[PDB]
Amino acid sequence: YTEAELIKLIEQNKHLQRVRADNCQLVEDIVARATRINLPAYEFLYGDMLAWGVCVEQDVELGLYYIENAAHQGLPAALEQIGRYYSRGTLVQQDKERAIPYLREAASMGNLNARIHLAELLLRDYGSPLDYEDAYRWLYNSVTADKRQHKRITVLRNGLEQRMPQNVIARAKRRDTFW
Amino acid sequence: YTEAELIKLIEQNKHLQRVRADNCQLVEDIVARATRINLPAYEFLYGDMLAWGVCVEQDVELGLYYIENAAHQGLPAALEQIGRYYSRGTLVQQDKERAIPYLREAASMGNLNARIHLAELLLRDYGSPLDYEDAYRWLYNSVTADKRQHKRITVLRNGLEQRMPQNVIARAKRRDTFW
Amino acid sequence: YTEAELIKLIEQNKHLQRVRADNCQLVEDIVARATRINLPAYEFLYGDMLAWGVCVEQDVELGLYYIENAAHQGLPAALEQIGRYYSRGTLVQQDKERAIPYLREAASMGNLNARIHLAELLLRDYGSPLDYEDAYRWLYNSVTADKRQHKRITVLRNGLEQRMPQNVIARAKRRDTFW
Amino acid sequence: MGKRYVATPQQSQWEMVVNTPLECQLVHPIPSFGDAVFSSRANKKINLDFELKMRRPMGETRNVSLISMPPPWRPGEHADRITNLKFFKQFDGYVGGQTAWGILSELEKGRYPTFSYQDWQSRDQRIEVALSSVLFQNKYNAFSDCISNLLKYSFEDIAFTILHYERQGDQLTKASKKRLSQIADYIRHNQDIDLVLVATYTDSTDGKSASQSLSERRAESLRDYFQSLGLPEDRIQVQGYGKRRPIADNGSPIGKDKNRRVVISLGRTQ
Amino acid sequence: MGKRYVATPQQSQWEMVVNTPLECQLVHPIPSFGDAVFSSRANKKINLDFELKMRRPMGETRNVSLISMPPPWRPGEHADRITNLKFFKQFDGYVGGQTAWGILSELEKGRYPTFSYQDWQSRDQRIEVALSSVLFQNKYNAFSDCISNLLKYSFEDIAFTILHYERQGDQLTKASKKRLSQIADYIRHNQDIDLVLVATYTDSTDGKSASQSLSERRAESLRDYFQSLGLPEDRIQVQGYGKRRPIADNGSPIGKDKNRRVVISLGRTQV
Amino acid sequence: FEDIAFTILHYERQGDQLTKASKKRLSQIADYIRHNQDIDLVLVATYTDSTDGKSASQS
């Protein structure tokens, strides 16, 4: 795999499906690239392979370690995955308040899933109003092509708007924000 | 055209008719003389040609610009034309109080049309009594051969006389005034 | 086209009709001139063609991009185009107060349509009563041969005057010279 | 109760801020509200502007009532309704024409001109603003004196001037010298005039070289005169066009005198 | 007997914190509670913010009642109900529009603007927060003087400017000089701008080389001027185009006047 | 400490300076560090885009 294709597959959540479609012929290459070169895309892929035990044996601790290393280097999907693992209690002990920072960082980097999940957590009182602004900002200038996700984003935006004054809302809609 | 003949045609308001009678064969010469030599008679002629769009295309701004240049150099007919354009709202936004100075200058130079129009504007309260004297003076020693215009001038003179004291009237009739 | 020819075509809102008449032979010429040398008139023409799909495939996003490219150059017609698009909601979300700053620059450049639309928007309460003086000045100094446009400008001037102290109207009517 | 903005006799003061032959400005500070400014300018017509300048700008356009209320120290006198104005949003209140002179007159009688309207900044409640007549008489006399000493022409009346020369000599005619004196007065009293354009040109009687020499000598004399008024040399522009560009029919005695002329054009920075 | 936060006549004080042509700020410290801040800023339109800043932030979003209560030393006077606001969790209380001017007006009349609400930090009991009108009038006069001296335009109004040059020389027209002076005032007082694009053009009178040289000359003159205004060199990006890229018909003097222009674009990022 | 322990900052397209938001976050980090004496380790991992050459990118 090239790095760019692996990154794009990671963002679409089809890296595991692709590796299965290859009948797991590149497993040795993935292991070598992740463990030795420390390529964040390959680190995330190897961590997901170890964690959920596809082809390779199921080693939850080591898989989470390599996912955390991909996050260390800063792969937004890795941060989002760790955040949703903490928020939903998948392979880890459920701690939404611990999930919040990971999701916040992934959202700040540009991960739409992280943005939606963070807004949902905040609307359940699992954070502080001192986030709403940023979260609202991140939900404001976000472009999606899925009508279902678009409706969900609009609903979350209105839910956040019902909780901040006009001063803060004005400041949020009037800031430089990208990704 | 010679300069003197063009000036006399301008004073009679037949320069455009003459140019039409020539079937617009000297248009290039008119353009060259106005734009390059800056001859006030040709500047006024070119401005009228551009403004009302005869033979040449209708360019109101440029025509008024060249008329204003003819006025800059001091052609009395140009000043009178700009004044009556402002007073009647022809090709410009109607502002009689703005028209007044142009008409006043043209009248002071000797333009009979400017004198009559200025007296008419003053008699409609579109100026100040501090003009009447001069205007009255300009209407007093003015010689016309048209009986209709002579009657109009006499009427305007009486209208101005009904508004100034005997002191000012005496001073007005007793001053050096020409053209 | 040379460029002055193209500019004159643009000012008369006939450039797209001109390109249509010429049977779409200028397509690649326009594209190359717009995106290679960045000629503002060619940039505006290309943006218009991309916007409405004239002799090219329609591309609203890039069309507006090239219209903006022309506007930031200084073209009076691109600025008015951007302001009118923002005010009408054509090809973009409707936004009057965003429109006004664009219309102001085109009006200051001499664009009559920008002046008229700026006056219409200000009389509709889409700007602070601090843009009234400039709009009135621009309309007051406007010259036109179309009696419909003349009457429109006069009516808009009266409407603007019905919101100003008349110490501001007098200030709008003052000039730095006799002309 | 209501909010009434007026200067108490210990606070009331009138000032003549601008006292020049080109402008007069009488200012009455209304405490906690702002200023009341009467301005008269050099012009051919009678003009006075009254501006109620407010520290906090006008919130919305409101109908205003102008009354001539008697002061407290005048029992038994009733109030006279003067007129109804309109104060506009984000603009100072303006009264002009005969009503501004009437405000000055009501102040001369010892009364209080009162503007009453509903203030947007004050929860849409009715407020009054009064002009005090205490210490008004002396400043009204000074204002009348300055109005007496105002130029009877404005920048519009002199910005373009055409002067004529005598048949023999380098001197202007009598009327042209009078107009040049008017121009010099306005220039010497106005510091906002930046540009002077001089375009001398003569009759066809002399030779072309002679015409050019006469025109240039006249232009240089006028440039030196304009320098004498205090303008820097980088502002004055002078050009001699000789016997070219005739505005009148050369050959007639009157036409040649017409063409023997100078154009003086002023330009200000308002 | 509930909790009432008000400054006693000996404790009340009003201060002008920010007094600049870009912002005016008036602060009333409410003892044991926090501050009440009136902020006005340079803009094309009337604007006033009232912010009730609390030492202990708002615990829950609550409905707040704004009343114009008479002080104790005014017997026989009833209280005027002004409005109902909503104070939000962990955000300073905000009042804006005509209601903030109404609070200032009720203070100008010797009354106490009182906000009443249920406090989360107080076992959900009703508490009052009042602004004292003692020593207010002098500072209200200073605040209104500051408001009168505010610039009548904001950054949005000077972001994109097309200036014009005269036919002879390298000096800007009168209107262009005025607009440049406005830009200079705002920049002098703000200096936050991070992108200053100065693209100069010329008419078709001179040759290509001469026009390019003149345009670059004027561009660098403007760059030096903007540096003198205090902006760092890195933010300024000047570019001369000479006779290239006309916007008007160079066949008329009006077109040449339109073509001798300079485009100054100011850009900043709030984030 | 949970909100700032991991931070990712961005650089401008041309130059060696951080963006505005990245400088703001760096100021937040500096405040927390200057007020907290218990912070022992700082790990910094800069890396750039592919536009420049590999040696240039490393430099």
User: What distances in angstroms separate CA D74 from CA D71, D78, D136, one per listed residue?
Assistant: 6, 9, 17
CA distances from A125 to A111, A119, A137 (A): 21, 10, 18
Q: How many CB atoms lie within 10 A of CB E196?
A: 24
Q: How many CB atoms lie within 10 A of CB A23?
A: 9
| A110/A141 Cα distance (integer angstroms) | 11
Q: Please list every residue in chain A whose beta carbon sits closer than 8 Å to the beta carbon of residue E270.
A: 174-176
- Structure tokens that stand for E86 in this block: 């909503």
CA–CA separation, E160 vs E176, rounded Å? 13
Q: Which of D96, D91, D64, D69 is nearest to D80 (CA)?
A: D69
Are C167 and C154 in contact, with CB atoms under 8 Å apart? no
Whether residue A131 lies within 8 A of chain F, CB to CB, comes out as: no
Give one DSSP letter per residue of chain D, joined into a string: --EEE---TTT---EEEEEETTEEEEEEEETTTEEEEEEEE--SS---EEEEEESSPP-S-EEEEEEEEPPTT-TT---EEEEEEEEPTTS-EEEETHHHHHHHHHHHTT-EEEEEEEEGGGTTEEEEEE---TT-HHHHHHHHHHHHT--S--HHHHSEEEEEB-SSSS-B-HHHHHHHHHHHHHHHH-S-EEEEEEEEE--SSS-HHHHHHHHHHHHHHHHHHHHHTT--TTTEEEEE-TT-S-SS-BTBHHHHHHHSEEEEEEEE--
Distance between CA C167 and CA C171 in Å, rounded? 6
Residue type, E246: P
Q: Distance (Å, rounded) from C-alpha B63 to C-alpha B46? A: 7
C-alpha–C-alpha distance, residues C156 and C121, integer Å: 10
Alpha-carbon gap, residue C179 to D268, rounded angstroms: 12
Closest CA to D32 of D119, D141, D147, D160: D119
Q: At how many Å resolution was this determined? A: 3.2
Give me the residue label for tokens 């909601």: C89
Both tokens assigned to B11:
């004073």
Cα–Cα distance for residue pair D194/D266, rounded to 1 Å: 8
Q: Which positions in chain E have a beta carbon within 8 angstroms of at least one beta carbon in chain C? A: 44-45, 152-153, 156-157, 159-162, 174-175, 199, 201, 244-251, 254, 258, 261, 263, 265
DSSP label of E111: -
Q: CB of D194 within 8 A of CB of D270? A: no
Structure tokens at E264: 């100054």
3-class secondary structure, E80? strand
Chain D positions in Cβ-Cβ contact with residue B104 (cut-off 8 Å): 157
Question: Using a CB-CB distance cutoff of 8 angstroms, which residues of chain E are in contact with residue F15?
Answer: 234
Report the DSSP beta bridge partners of residue E130: E114
User: Which residue shows structure tokens 């500070």?
Assistant: D29
Distance CA E90, CA C54 (A): 55
CA distance D238 to C143: 31
Round to whole Å and give the CA distance between C140 and E88: 50
Tell me which residue of B179, B34, B73 sits closest to D200, measured CA to CA: B73
Residue D167: CB atoms within 10 A of its CB come to 11
Beta carbons of F15 and E271 less than 8 Å apart: no
Three-state SS at C4: helix
Taken as a whole, chain A contains a residue count of 179
The identity of residue E170, as a single letter, is D
- The DSSP symbol for C178 reads -
- The closest CB to that of D57, out of E46, E104, E105, belongs to E46
Distance CA C120, CA C138 (A): 13
Q: What is the DSSP string of chain A?
A: --HHHHHHHHHHT-HHHHHHHTTS-SHHHHHHIIIII--HHHHHHHHHHHHHTSSS---HHHHHHHHHHHHHHT-HHHHHHHHHHHHHTSSS---HHHHHHHHHHHHHHT-HHHHHHHHHHHTTTSS-HHHHHHHHHHHHT-----HHHHHHHHHHHHHHHTTS-HHHHHHHHTS----
Rounded Cα distance between C157 and B22, Å, is: 42
Amino acid at D72: P
Chain F residues whose beta carbon lies within 8 Å of the beta carbon of residue A104: 3
CA D190 to chain centre: 10
Would the CA dihedral through D184, D188, D189, D193 be positive or negative? positive
Against chain C, the chains showing at least 3 CB pairs within 8 Å are B, D, E
Residue with tokens 């601790």, as numbered in its chain: A61
What's the one-letter identity of residue E266?
L
SS3 E240: strand
DSSP code of E235? G
Element (H, E) at E86: strand E80-87
Q: Please give the structure tokens belonging to residue B135.
A: 């205007």
Cβ <8 Å between C101 and E159: yes
DSSP assignment letter at E233: G
Close Cβ partners of E185 (under 8 Å, ≥ 6 residues apart): E21, E151
Are D74 and D112 within 8 A, CB to CB?
A: no
Please answer whether residues A38 and A78 qualify as being in contact, where contact means their C-beta atoms are separated by less than 8 angstroms: no
Does D45 contact B40 at a Cβ distance shorter than 8 Å?
A: no
- Report the residue from E49, E94, E270 with minimal CB separation from A174: E270
Distance of CA E48 to the CA centre of its chain: 10
Alpha carbon D52 to chain centroid, angstroms: 19
Neighbour tally for A53: CB within 10 Å: 12
CA distances from A5 to A11, A112, D153 (A): 10, 19, 82
Residue C35 carries which side chain, given as an amino acid letter? Answer: T
Residue F38 neighbours by CB distance under 10 Å: 5
The residues facing D165 across adjacent strands are: D172
